[PDB]
Amino acid sequence: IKNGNDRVAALLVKEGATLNIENAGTFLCTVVAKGDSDFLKRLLSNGIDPNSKDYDHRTPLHVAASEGFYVLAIQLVEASANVLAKDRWGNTPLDEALGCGNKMLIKLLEDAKNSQISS
Amino acid sequence: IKNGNDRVAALLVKEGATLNIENAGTFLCTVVAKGDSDFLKRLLSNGIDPNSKDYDHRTPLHVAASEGFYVLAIQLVEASANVLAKDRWGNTPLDEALGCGNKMLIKLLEDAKNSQISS
Amino acid sequence: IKNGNDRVAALLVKEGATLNIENAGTFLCTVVAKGDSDFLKRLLSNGIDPNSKDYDHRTPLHVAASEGFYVLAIQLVEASANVLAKDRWGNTPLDEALGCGNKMLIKLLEDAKNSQISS
């Protein structure tokens, strides 16, 4: 997936494959810091957990909501990632997006909040 | 350095080798979580820059303050990694150290912060 | 858009064309320096996002506030590019608009800021 060879990657999972890496919460939030949207597309297709905690129990939304990757947030929420998490000092990802200020993210956060409320 | 062969590292620095890695701050924010103080000492042996910050602008002082360490903080104090730099959340490491607790290390951190401010 | 042929733009958007550029936020700062309001008005016809910020985190409201414009200030008011976002220097655009002057536009900006805050 790093080299973008999905054809072999597709048949690799068919025969039985999985991702076994450490600090995945810290690793993935580094990827979203660079801003590359192509890289995160094929990771979620292989079942990677999007709610993995970082070194400070920081969800990827904490990095995502602060900077405001509204477009790079639809793919993550397609995996039913939790939005009721907390920051290191205590901050909801939906509240984190609201604090920074983003109308597009607020609507997305409200939809996530509505989905979370509906459960 | 990773393999622990400090003896052979003397020839490398004598030859004129230098340390240069990408996202150094993020690397510094997870080794403290690992707690490899002995391996951390070798990092300071080569004089690596301690002012590196991650995507969240969190210096190693910030995570150490949250971790509530004493021996590592004293070792970090020897490295002299800034005094009080606001992170993404805007909380100074001195405030984080006081808020976290560890009065045995907070008093040392406060004395170090006062000395750093005076200097 | 650059050549001013708005007639072919209607067919292009009907075909489903998208406006994506790199370092977009910096572009909205230099255009208002040139004062091409007619060219700027065409940009909003395609629904370009006005919340983009440069490397200094300066929204188009910030540079317009320093520029002390009135017609453009009325123009970006309809764009609704946030209310008051701190820049690298930490100065809100409303504070910058008030500090710069232009009471003819500052009063309109203050009313727009008050309306944006209420909304």
Side-chain angles (χ1 to χ4, degrees), chain B residues 72-73 75-76 79 81 85 88:
Chain B
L72 327 173
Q75 155 167 46
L76 163 148
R88 169 157 261 143

Side-chain angles (χ1 to χ4, degrees), chain B residues 35 37 39-40 42-48 50:
Chain B
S37 50
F39 154 97
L40 171 61
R42 320 157 52 75
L43 306 181
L44 319 179
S45 307
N46 57 76
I48 192 59

Side-chain angles (χ1 to χ4, degrees), chain B residues 63 93:
Chain B
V63 50

